[PDB]
Amino acid sequence: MSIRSLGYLRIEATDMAAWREYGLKVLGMVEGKGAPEGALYLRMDDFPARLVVVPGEHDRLLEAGWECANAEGLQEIRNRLDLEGTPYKEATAAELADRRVDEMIRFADPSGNCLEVFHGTALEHRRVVSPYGHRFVTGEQGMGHVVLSTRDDAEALHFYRDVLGFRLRDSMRLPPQMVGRPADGPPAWLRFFGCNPRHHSLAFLPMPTSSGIVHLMVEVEQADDVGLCLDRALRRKVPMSATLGRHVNDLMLSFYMKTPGGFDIEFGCEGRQVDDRDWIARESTAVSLWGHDFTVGA
Amino acid sequence: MSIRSLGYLRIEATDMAAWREYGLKVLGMVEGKGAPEGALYLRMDDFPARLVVVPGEHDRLLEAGWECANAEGLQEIRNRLDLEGTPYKEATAAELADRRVDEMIRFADPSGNCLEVFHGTALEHRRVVSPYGHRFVTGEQGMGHVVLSTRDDAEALHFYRDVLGFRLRDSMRLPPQMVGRPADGPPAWLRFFGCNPRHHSLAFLPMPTSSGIVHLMVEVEQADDVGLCLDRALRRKVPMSATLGRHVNDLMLSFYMKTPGGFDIEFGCEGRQVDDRDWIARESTAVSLWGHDFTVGA
Amino acid sequence: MSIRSLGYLRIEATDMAAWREYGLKVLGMVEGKGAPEGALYLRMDDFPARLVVVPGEHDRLLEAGWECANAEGLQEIRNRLDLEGTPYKEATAAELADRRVDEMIRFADPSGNCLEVFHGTALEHRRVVSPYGHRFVTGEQGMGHVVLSTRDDAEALHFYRDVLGFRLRDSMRLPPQMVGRPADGPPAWLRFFGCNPRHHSLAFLPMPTSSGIVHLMVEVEQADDVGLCLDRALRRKVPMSATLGRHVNDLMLSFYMKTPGGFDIEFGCEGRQVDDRDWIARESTAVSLWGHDFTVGAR
Amino acid sequence: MSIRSLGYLRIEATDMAAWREYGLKVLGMVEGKGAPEGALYLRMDDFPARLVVVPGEHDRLLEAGWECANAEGLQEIRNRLDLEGTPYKEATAAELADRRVDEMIRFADPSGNCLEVFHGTALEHRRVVSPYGHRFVTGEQGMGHVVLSTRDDAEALHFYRDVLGFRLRDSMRLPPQMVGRPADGPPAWLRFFGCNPRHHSLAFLPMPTSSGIVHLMVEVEQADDVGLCLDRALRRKVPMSATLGRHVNDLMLSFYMKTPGGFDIEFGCEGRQVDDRDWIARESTAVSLWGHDFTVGAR
Amino acid sequence: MSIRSLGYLRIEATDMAAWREYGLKVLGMVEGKGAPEGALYLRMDDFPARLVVVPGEHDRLLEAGWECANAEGLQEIRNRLDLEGTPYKEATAAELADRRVDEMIRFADPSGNCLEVFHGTALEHRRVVSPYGHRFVTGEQGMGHVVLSTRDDAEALHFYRDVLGFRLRDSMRLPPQMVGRPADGPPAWLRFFGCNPRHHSLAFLPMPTSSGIVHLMVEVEQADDVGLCLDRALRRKVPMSATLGRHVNDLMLSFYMKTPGGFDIEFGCEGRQVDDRDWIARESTAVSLWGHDFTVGAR
Amino acid sequence: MSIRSLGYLRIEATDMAAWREYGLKVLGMVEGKGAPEGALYLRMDDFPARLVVVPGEHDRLLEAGWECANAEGLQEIRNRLDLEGTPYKEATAAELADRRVDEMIRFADPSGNCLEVFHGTALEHRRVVSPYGHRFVTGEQGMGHVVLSTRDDAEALHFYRDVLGFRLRDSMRLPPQMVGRPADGPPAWLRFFGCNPRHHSLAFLPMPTSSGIVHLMVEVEQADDVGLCLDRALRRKVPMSATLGRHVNDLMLSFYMKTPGGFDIEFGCEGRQVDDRDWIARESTAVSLWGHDFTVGAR
Ligand SMILES: Cc1ccc(O)c(O)c1CC[C@@H]1C(=O)CC[C@]2(C)C(=O)CC[C@@H]12
Ligand SMILES: Cc1ccc(O)c(O)c1CC[C@@H]1C(=O)CC[C@]2(C)C(=O)CC[C@@H]12
Ligand SMILES: Cc1ccc(O)c(O)c1CC[C@@H]1C(=O)CC[C@]2(C)C(=O)CC[C@@H]12
Ligand SMILES: Cc1ccc(O)c(O)c1CC[C@@H]1C(=O)CC[C@]2(C)C(=O)CC[C@@H]12
Ligand SMILES: Cc1ccc(O)c(O)c1CC[C@@H]1C(=O)CC[C@]2(C)C(=O)CC[C@@H]12
Ligand SMILES: Cc1ccc(O)c(O)c1CC[C@@H]1C(=O)CC[C@]2(C)C(=O)CC[C@@H]12
Ligand SMILES: [Fe+2]
Ligand SMILES: [Fe+2]
Ligand SMILES: [Fe+2]
Ligand SMILES: [Fe+2]
Ligand SMILES: [Fe+2]
Ligand SMILES: [Fe+2]
């Protein structure tokens, strides 16, 4: 059907205490109920967790989990993966119980970022209330989007578009020097990927990161929610990556800020919806309409 | 096309007089014109009957009738049934006249609840007016939904989803003890089934009942209609199964009450509509958002 | 302009720990700052407090507070009290500071019920977030309504309608023998008054109560918020006074429960709004369309 | 404020069994409770009765009842009757109890047509459910309209517009020779009055009728409700007075039929609503856009 | 209430056959019934006539007719004319019969322009169907607007605004030397007046015209109706005065053409509507946003 | 009627080249025609100028200009100034020609702040097109708002509310010790006034400024227009006074920056609109919901 949205992200961390206070006091997410080691479960809506943090010696991406509509929809991904020759494994009894899904397959892309593709998640039904009064925009758009590293842009395009069936939604070139090529280069390509109306749920920057993550975006309903988060971040001396601005691409009004795992979170609103029957995949030539001053890091 | 909705229910009863007064004074349905033995015909809209009660020595389900769009739509069900090897029979001349349909096939599932699958019903056109002023919600959603018993959940899923072509809309686990397994069990699964936008028209609880029915739901337009029915039920000392509440699943605002056939009726409003192009089949972990206190039986 | 809405309610209480637990875990209101020791401010929205609970020896109503649009709307109420000769005091500096208003007058109706009419309240701006996810319905409808006790319904009709300017919105007759009177001769009236679109902000029953108060109604956005409350209340063993129902007059979908003060709170949604330009004052002949079984049950 | 709408109509009748059968099986109204023996209460909505039928020796109109918003709206009507010197009586205790109102004044217009102006009516709250599935259109438009007979149209214009405050909404001229007058010299006027958005609540024809009444109009929601009525009426052999049509002035889609009192009822839908702030009083020159063939036919 | 709109225009004409042909084949109006011999009634809607053309020796305006809501709205205009001492006559019986109104007063403004203020017009109810498929825009906006000639703009301002109660809606200055005055010293003003939401019903130019009239504007629903008219007019060799354009003040999309009377008709759509509660009277400094090239061309 | 909105602002300036560059390249306003040598007209819409900048020796406010609906709305303001004995002069012929208005009166409030109240302004009709693609929000809300300096807040309250008729829309208390007063005893008030739906057109701070002006606010349609401005301002090295935020009182999403006059301009969107019939004048206790960090930073 087929992948349909970003379901969860599992990350590994060296500072579980900082994650807990950043997730609860800056992001205004809600902590989920146990939660093994722990192991922090961060909640946005009726999913048992969207952001799962497990303790370890590295600050990195473990898995990205991707929701399908049903059993048939997972089978479609299986059939595609076999057609290409991508090795994949069924979740073990213990993995299904842990993620709380009916079926799941595990595999990596050629970079290899690890993927979990699943169907039949459990939901928790008590209202999830942020103490700051914002609601996240999830539903049919899913969790948010993730921008990850790739070792090779053309190879990512192949895997995500041709093998897995994402749609190419947007493309932006990088000057050859920024990816270590001679100024004489081939530019390289940052490509954005859609699986549902959310402009993108996924993108591949062909430059390295230590975590494997460039940014995670989560969306709230209103500008005020973004603005109030900015103030909570500033008050807690969270480092800023980009100033408030509006994207050209997805029309998201957002700021970026460093998380305790070293990568950025984009916290935004007003994200653009895409119909695949109308959409023309083209190249954008700027990141923002205004704002998003990425020089603010240093 | 293919099954499209719940058309009617035929039940057998030991107390025809209690049915008549419950159907007319509590449910505010209208009695249809003859009506063999009798045989009570209960009406909700322009169908000649939705709930047909025939006298006998048991309080049980006889058949569930399922409407298709047309001749081609019934043929599609025939072709599916032959593909699996399910024996089925054409209605006799006398059966077609009795149900008042153009074509119908008779068969049972592996449990075997008996099914009638038909097209080309007659309608009656005089306004059907409840003396209590409510209107039932039928139309493209059909009669309502029925929760029946199954001897085996996985076998029901097969028959209904893979053979007949219902969509899996929702799934809820039962602890192993409640179905007679050791506390060490496999949980068993209550699975909800859709054939049109009505969240579900059918569900299978894998625990026995004497009638074969767990509940029949009928929907009215407004909360007030539900509330007024509650008061009519209480006044007539109808026993309650669950208190007013809201479902997690289908978002139905409803109460359950025992009928004269021993099974419950859920009388509700505000039921959720589902688009199969968007819908993610997931597992719910609670029955209600609030209310629906099922301890009220004893 | 006139009085425009119900602003706040100040009550006295014998169990402060029970009110805090109630206010917070059943009602889902939010604690304000920084009431006197150990008074309790309970918030619904950007009012510094809508329900103020102060320690004492009775469970009783102290004052109902009534909001005016501005200084001139308050003057119009002085002028009306003067025409009648109704005594009123201007608030003291400490009272203004305490209530967080710019002006305020105090008086009592003829049954001794105490009013504070004010304008120019401070507001607090950080979002009030119920742990339970509901939002209250206030704004131009104000905090809700209050049903108080009265000694004489004809004297109250005159004070509230003719002197103060509320509009009579509905009336319901009560049997002469359950007021203490014969079985021939005049009924007693429950009268519902409004000062804004909320069908009623005020009603008066001529029947005696220990606290001064027959009920406080607070309104939430949706049926789900009412059902989730009822469920918290049942879990916390709160005594029920009336089952869920829908009223005939204001079409409120609500249930009633006993508070730590032993008066009811009505917790409801879907309240009907009234335009004075077309509204006909009539007599209702039932409490409910359906439910609201007071048998469960007090009083 | 003023009179705001038509409340009820009380008629006298020679055949009570025929009116009950009519009221119930043709009109699809609902029987109320518990009229005097063997009076008939016919209900459209939550009014205890809108058409009250009492046993007698004639088929005639007894009183038209006119609803005011509240006590002060009734006082405004006293004050207007006093300015003119129009005699009126206050209702007795038994009359108040009988009509289920809080106050009521009785008088007559100069042709002797009797009015009851009231406020504070009781309502009944259990759903009124027509066996035929239609809903009537009442609310702020009230029960409907009535076309009565008048002796002098200029005296009626003054009483109804100038003394009582209805607005003139439309006028239609009638030939001088079908009033009894020459063939040179002045026409007689049919004048349509309103007191709310319903294009008219009241009209007066200067032409004689046995009953006092030219017609009663009641309004249902949709065309289908009108067509289904017409069909019940044809099945019950009710005498038709005018075929289905659409009026020019109120754009009512309606037919006319004879009642057991021998006056017409107009049964219609799609009535036009009027805002007094922009409404121009003019003269219509036809009854209908189409249909309404009175040839079928009375009178 | 006051004058509420422009009702009708009566003009005198030297060529009756040309006006009928124009009225009917260019304007797409419909012939009314049964004007005097051989006067011409031209209809836009249910008014018996909106443009009445009578045989004579000049092409001139006879009277502008102005509609009031009712008898009391007409009295308010008498009262205003009396305060000023402006002479007016009541209409005669034959005049009432002729104009098909219930009351009417005649007077002239200080430049001698003749007004008929009326209420209680007859309407005709069979559908007025333009052979060309357009509908005119009238209703509460009335027949359209008229730009007349004035001797003194300050005297007209006083008569129309202060005595009669139109609102000043816009003003446009005219060069002192094209009024006949020096080159130092005061401009002359074109003033636009309204009595309903139509941006203007009346304007006055202090510049001389043979007919009394600078222009008549009539409004149709859509741009297509304007373009189809222009095309009939070009086919019939009607002299153009101004090409299609959009006005700055009323945002009318219109063209101007010469009539058989030699004054212009403006034929337009999309006229802007005004609410007096927020409308600011200002000065425009151009006729058009675009087009309306009067060079084509008269005058 | 009264004053209806803020019309224009006239300021004096020491650097004219800096204001032109600012006005044009940061604000995205459009240059008007043909101001005196070398005065600067800055346009937002069809007003000939909304911000008029004239060469001088200080950066100061000269006059705020206030628009009335018509001649009679201006008379109502004369009448109010007369009741108080407030001196005002009628404008001279050259002043009328210069301001492009029909009438105008000049006076000063009791702190010496100079007002020009006018009606009958000329408009210019060719589209005003910002090079940056934004549209300003003016119309019935007028040019924006201005926060001026005051010597006494109680005297200003009386002048602006009681004499001139603005409505008090909000109030915010300021610490007694940052006005120069003790630490016991009375706060000073920031008061926000409005004359139309724009939450405020005018506010007064009792704190000293070199220019007369605390800030000018101008409003654009959307958040994107604000963000694109901020970006032009950062590129042009304009000094920031307050970061982007949302106000508590008018829900304006805006940032503040220093102008070439050294007073702030607030550049914002999403301003809340007020209906006087339901608006309650209250006290706010924060500047912002979020952002608006004045630390960045002046003053
Ligand atoms: C460039 C861009 C376009 C559209 C988006 O929705 C979006 O998130 C981005 C940013 C992706 C990416 C990032 O987050 C880290 C810093 C990067 C490499 C840049 O400086 C340009 C693109 C940036
Ligand atoms: C559990 C549930 C979820 C969603 C629904 O729409 C719905 O009707 C139900 C109830 C089904 C079922 C029942 O009616 C009898 C008592 C049962 C076994 C329970 O106590 C839980 C589920 C119940
Ligand atoms: C009748 C009624 C209508 C609308 C309301 O909002 C509302 O609170 C009521 C109830 C009034 C009153 C009460 O508060 C306590 C118990 C009373 C006396 C009853 O037993 C019936 C009316 C009740
Ligand atoms: C003309 C008319 C317009 C609107 C109405 O609602 C309406 O009832 C009428 C009819 C008035 C009147 C009547 O009732 C009996 C028969 C009459 C006299 C006719 O023959 C024409 C007008 C009719
Ligand atoms: C300027 C104007 C605005 C709105 C209108 O509806 C409208 O008719 C006009 C035109 C007024 C006037 C005219 O009728 C004849 C020729 C005139 C004098 C011109 O040449 C410019 C203004 C014109
Ligand atoms: C508080 C406020 C609310 C709504 C407004 O539109 C608005 O401009 C303000 C700001 C008022 C005022 C100012 O202009 C300069 C700096 C001030 C004194 C502050 O530091 C807080 C309030 C500010
Ligand atoms: Fe992003
Ligand atoms: Fe159910
Ligand atoms: Fe209540
Ligand atoms: Fe009628
Ligand atoms: Fe014109
Ligand atoms: Fe501001």
Tell me the two tokens of residue D211: 């009953």
Q: What angle do CA E200, E205, E206 make, to 5 degrees?
A: 150
> Which three-class secondary structure string do you get for chain F?
CCCCEEEEEEEEECCHHHHHHHHHHCCCCEECCCCCCCCEEEECCCCCCCEEEEECCCCEEEEEEEECCCHHHHHHHHHHHHHHCCCCEECCHHHHHHHCCCEEEEEECCCCCEEEEEECCECCCCCCCCCCCCCECCHHHCCCEEEEECCCHHHHHHHHHHHCCCEEEEEEEECHHHCCCCCCCCCEEEEEEECCCECCCEEEECCCCCCCEEEEEEEECCHHHHHHHHHHHHHCCCCEEEEEEEECCCCCEEEEEECCCCCEEEEEECCCECCCCCCCCCEECCCEEEECCHHHCCC
Q: How far is the CA of B257 from the CAs of A31, B213, B236, C234, E121, in angstroms? A: 38, 13, 12, 21, 66
What secondary structure letter does DSSP report for E158? Answer: I
> Would you put residue D147 in left (φ > 0), alpha (ψ -120 to 50) or beta?
beta
Tell me the two tokens of residue F116: 């020009």
First to last CA, chain A: 44
Report the nearest-CA residue for atom 9 of ligand 3. Answer: C287
Subunit contact D129:B127, Cβ cutoff 8 A: no
Q: How far is the CA of F280 from the CAs of A34, A134, C284, F164, F193, in angstroms? A: 48, 27, 33, 20, 13
Subunit contact A70:B168, Cβ cutoff 8 A: yes
Min CA distance, E233 vs chain D (Å)? 34
Mapped onto helix, strand or coil, the DSSP state of residue B238 is coil
Instruction: Please give the Cα distance from B154 to B141 (Å, whole number).
Output: 26
Q: How far is the CA of D169 from the CAs of C151, D157, E222, F139, in angstroms? A: 48, 12, 31, 38
Subunit contact E119:D289, Cβ cutoff 8 A: no
**What are the residues whose beta carbons fall under 8 Å from the beta carbon of B87, sequence distance 6 or more?**
B107
Closest CB to F284: pick one of C4, C71, C123: C123
Rg (CA), chain A: 18
> Which three-class secondary structure string do you get for E182-197?
CCCCCCEEEEEEECCC
Q: What angle do CA E236, E237, E239 make, to 5 degrees?
A: 125
Mapped onto helix, strand or coil, the DSSP state of residue D20 is helix
Mapped onto helix, strand or coil, the DSSP state of residue B97 is helix
Domains present along chain E, CATH in parentheses: 1-133 (3.10.180.10), 134-299 (3.10.180.10)
Establish whether residue B294 lines the binding site of ligand 2, counting it when its CB lies within 6 angstroms of any ligand atom: yes
Instruction: Please give the Cα distance from B243 to C240 (Å, whole number).
Output: 15
Strand partners, F205: F149
Mapped onto helix, strand or coil, the DSSP state of residue A212 is coil
> Which three-class secondary structure string do you get for F135-196?
CECCHHHCCCEEEEECCCHHHHHHHHHHHCCCEEEEEEEECHHHCCCCCCCCCEEEEEEECC
- β-pairing, E167-174 vs E283-284, is parallel
Determine if the peptide bond prior to D299 is cis (ω within 30°). yes
Which residue in D295, D294, D146, D149 sits closest to D209, CA to CA? D149
- Check: CB of residue F257 under 8 Å from CB of residue F239: yes
> Would you put residue D212 in left (φ > 0), alpha (ψ -120 to 50) or beta?
left
- Check: CB of residue D215 under 8 Å from CB of residue D265: yes
Instruction: Please give the Cα distance from E59 to E53 (Å, whole number).
Output: 10
A266 is in an annotated binding site: yes
Subunit contact D122:C289, Cβ cutoff 8 A: no
- Phi and psi at D112, nearest 5°, equal 95, -5
Instruction: Please give the Cα distance from A58 to A12 (Å, whole number).
Output: 6
Rg (CA), chain E: 18
Q: For CA atoms F114, F120, F125, F127, give the dihedral sign.
A: positive
Subunit contact C281:D70, Cβ cutoff 8 A: yes
Instruction: Please give the Cα distance from F22 to D236 (Å, whole number).
Output: 86
In what helix (H) or strand (E) does residue B3 lie, and over which residues does it extend? none
Which residue in E127, E138, E74, E141 sits closest to E101, CA to CA? E74
Establish whether residue B292 lines the binding site of ligand 2, counting it when its CB lies within 6 angstroms of any ligand atom: no
Establish whether residue F43 lines the binding site of ligand 6, counting it when its CB lies within 6 angstroms of any ligand atom: no
Strand order in the sheet with C188-194: C283-284, C167-174, C188-194, C202-205, C145-149, C213-219, C264-269, C253-258, C240-247, C288-291
- Check: CB of residue F246 under 8 Å from CB of residue A226: no
Calculate the CA dihedral of residues B18, B20, B23, B29 and round it to 10 degrees: -170
- Phi and psi at F72, nearest 5°, equal -75, -35
- HSE-up of residue C3 (Cα within 13 Å, Cβ side): 31
**What are the residues whose beta carbons fall under 8 Å from the beta carbon of F68, sequence distance 6 or more?**
F1, F2, F3, F4, F74, F76, F77, F117, F118, F119
Which chains form contacts with chain B, at 3 or more CB pairs under 8 Å?
A, C, D
Q: How far is the CA of E261 from the CAs of E50, E151, E209, E216, E255, in angstroms? A: 16, 21, 11, 11, 17
Subunit contact F289:C125, Cβ cutoff 8 A: yes
Strand stretches in chain C, DSSP E: 5-13, 30-31, 40-43, 51-55, 60-67, 89-90, 103-108, 114-119, 145-149, 167-174, 188-194, 202-205, 213-219, 240-247, 253-258, 264-269, 283-284, 288-291
Instruction: Please give the Cα distance from C284 to C171 (Å, whole number).
Output: 6
- Residues in chain F with CB shorter than 8 Å from the CB of C120 are 171, 281-283
- Check: CB of residue E120 under 8 Å from CB of residue D283: yes
Instruction: Please give the Cα distance from C179 to C153 (Å, whole number).
Output: 11
Instruction: Please give the Cα distance from D198 to D46 (Å, whole number).
Output: 19
In what helix (H) or strand (E) does residue A76 lie, and over which residues does it extend? helix A71-84
Q: How was this structure determined?
A: X-ray
- Check: CB of residue D200 under 8 Å from CB of residue D207: no
Strand stretches in chain D, DSSP E: 5-13, 30-31, 40-43, 51-55, 60-67, 89-90, 103-108, 114-119, 145-149, 167-174, 188-194, 202-205, 213-219, 240-247, 253-258, 264-269, 283-284, 288-291
Interface of D with C in 58-77 (CB under 8 A): 67, 69-71
Instruction: Please give the Cα distance from C162 to C110 (Å, whole number).
Output: 13
First to last CA, chain F: 36
- Check: CB of residue D270 under 8 Å from CB of residue E57: no
- HSE-up of residue F253 (Cα within 13 Å, Cβ side): 18
Which residue in E15, E40, E16, E44 sits closest to E29, CA to CA? E44
Using a 10 angstrom Cβ sphere, with 0-12 exposed, 13-18 middle and 19 or more buried, the burial of residue E87 is exposed
A58 is in an annotated binding site: no
- β-pairing, A145-149 vs A202-205, is parallel
> Could you say which ligand is closest to the alpha carbon of residue D264?
4
Distance from CA of residue F168 to its chain's centroid?
A: 16
Instruction: Please give the Cα distance from F225 to F218 (Å, whole number).
Output: 12
- Annotated resolution, angstroms: 2.2
B133 touches chain C (CB under 8 A): no
B200 is in an annotated binding site: yes
Q: What angle do CA B89, B93, B99 make, to 5 degrees?
A: 85
Count other C-beta atoms under 10 Å from residue C6's C-beta.
26
Establish whether residue B148 lines the binding site of ligand 2, counting it when its CB lies within 6 angstroms of any ligand atom: no
Which chains form contacts with chain A, at 3 or more CB pairs under 8 Å?
B, C, F
Instruction: Please give the Cα distance from F148 to F146 (Å, whole number).
Output: 6
E289 touches chain F (CB under 8 A): yes
Quick one: closest CA in A to F247, which residue?
A: A224
D129 touches chain B (CB under 8 A): yes
**What are the residues whose beta carbons fall under 8 Å from the beta carbon of F30, sequence distance 6 or more?**
F24, F42, F43, F44, F128, F129, F130
Q: How far is the CA of E243 from the CAs of E239, E253, E254, E268, in angstroms? A: 11, 11, 8, 12
Q: Do chains B and F touch (3 or more CB pairs under 8 A)?
A: no
Mapped onto helix, strand or coil, the DSSP state of residue E140 is helix
Count other C-beta atoms under 10 Å from residue C108's C-beta.
14
Q: Relative to the CA of F215, which ligand 6 atom is closest?
A: 14
Rg (CA), chain C: 18
What secondary structure letter does DSSP report for B198? Answer: B
Q: How far is the CA of B4 from the CAs of B77, B80, B163, F41, in angstroms? A: 11, 15, 15, 70
Q: How far is the CA of C49 from the CAs of A130, C42, C52, C218, F288, in angstroms? A: 22, 5, 6, 14, 21
Q: How far is the CA of C42 from the CAs of C8, C130, C228, D51, E287, in angstroms? A: 10, 11, 19, 52, 63
- β-pairing, D253-258 vs D264-269, is antiparallel
Output the DSSP codes for C192-259. Answer: EEESSSBS-SEEEESS--SSSEEEEEEEBSSHHHHHHHHHHHHHTTPPEEEEEEEESSS--EEEEEE-
Burial E163-177 (b: 16+ CB within 10 A, else e): bbebbbbbbbeeeee
Strand partners, C218: C267
- Phi and psi at A134, nearest 5°, equal -85, 155
- β-pairing, D202-205 vs D188-194, is antiparallel
In what helix (H) or strand (E) does residue B2 lie, and over which residues does it extend? none
Instruction: Please give the Cα distance from C187 to C181 (Å, whole number).
Output: 9
- HSE-up of residue A275 (Cα within 13 Å, Cβ side): 2
Instruction: Please give the Cα distance from D52 to D12 (Å, whole number).
Output: 9
Tell me the two tokens of residue C55: 């320690």
Count other C-beta atoms under 10 Å from residue C128's C-beta.
17
Instruction: Please give the Cα distance from B264 to D102 (Å, whole number).
Output: 48
Strand partners, A198: A273
- Phi and psi at C242, nearest 5°, equal -160, 135
Tell me the two tokens of residue C94: 């400490």
**CA–centroid distance, residue B29 to ligand 8 (Å):** 19
- HSE-up of residue F14 (Cα within 13 Å, Cβ side): 9
Q: Report the length, in residues, of chain A.
A: 298
Binding site membership of F for Fe cation: which residues? Answer: 145, 215, 266
Q: Report the length, in residues, of chain C.
A: 299
Report the nearest-CA residue for atom 22 of ligand 2. Answer: B287
Establish whether residue B64 lines the binding site of ligand 2, counting it when its CB lies within 6 angstroms of any ligand atom: no
Q: What angle do CA D149, D154, D160 make, to 5 degrees?
A: 70
- Check: CB of residue B160 under 8 Å from CB of residue B193: yes
